[PDB]
Amino acid sequence: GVIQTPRHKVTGKGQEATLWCEPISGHSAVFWYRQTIVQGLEFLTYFRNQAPIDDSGMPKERFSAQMPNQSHSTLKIQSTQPQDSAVYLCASSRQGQNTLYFGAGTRLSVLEDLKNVFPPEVAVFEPSEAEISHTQKATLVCLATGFYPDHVELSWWVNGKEVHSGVCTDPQPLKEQPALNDSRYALSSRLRVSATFWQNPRNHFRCQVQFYGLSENDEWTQDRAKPVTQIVSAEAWGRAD
Amino acid sequence: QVEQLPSILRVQEGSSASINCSYEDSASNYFPWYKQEPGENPKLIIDIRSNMERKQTQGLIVLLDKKAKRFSLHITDTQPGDSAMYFCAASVRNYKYVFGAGTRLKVIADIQNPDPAVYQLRDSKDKSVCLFTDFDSQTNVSQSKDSDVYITDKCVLDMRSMDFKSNSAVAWSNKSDFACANAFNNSIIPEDTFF
Questions:
Q1: CA nearest to B31 within chain A
Q2: Contact A128/B100, CB-based, under 8 Å?
Q3: Please, which residues have CB within 8 angstroms of residue A113's CB and are 6 or more apart in sequence?
């Protein structure tokens, strides 16, 4: 269906950001919406065949929407501000159709200072001997710590294939320093397998965290490594005894 | 403009859950409902037109009262996994989809055979993490009253394969004076922590 890029965008205050949406082969296909915790789904703007029809919801400054061709649409924000941070959904609907199809959106995080962006450190912890003995089950745990902002995606890979059944990831990360508003985050996830499965030393477990940060375009003064968008992983092998 | 209630809906597994919406235009003709799983796109789940007053398909019921300008969604026998964000909308003619602000539905799971335990994990070389697991639904992992000790909230897993659900929470610290014995002084179910 509807393809939106990028999936995540981190910018600093005052940077420009443009958001891309490719609708489905259809006419009424702008339905830009903003999605936030406070205001929910908010109509922004609407196009029928490249023609601006309603821009009622668009902020009266800095925000603009265009349709270059009839197979793509853009949302441009000038001079990004923290309040601009949200998920920006794009949607399309056909002619004789009521159904509205949504994109997965672009998550925009506008930070005060890009000097506070850090990527996660990832580590995986092997099941408890006690747990195995008591329940005949083995729970692996993964810890992503010390990352900012909170654009992370955590996945479990068992022998090179990603797995889902028996995964539990925290729905929201925790602030490492919860007093401060601008704090680094941690996330934990659990993978629960049979004790037999863990005991097989040919089984390979990998916890993988996709972090979104700076693009290669962005400048980096500080004497540490620049926190680009990257994958950070940690592995463990099954163990017999 | 469309009002959707409630914003957050905590329902117990097996019980039914209802979301109500109301709209402010006599002209609205189509009322779709969208489910949205974290990270993904809203996906149409069921809809109803001004032609009809109730529809039941796909494990879902919707009502529409045009006179009252209210419509609702009803999910019977909730299971974790109905846990998602839902959204209602009202549309007029060929344009104009006005959406509710959404309902975050949390389905709380019935741990059948709880087995409260607190275990100690290790690896690679802090070093050590503690796992509080298999505790019942009515337990609150509270936050760390020790700074430099971190405790996650509970996490509900549901298997497709078996009819077993489990709760878990993770706690860790770099300190020397830290162990699993006395890490989770929340209102623990009175068992385990056996090493």
A1: A98
A2: no
A3: A12, A13
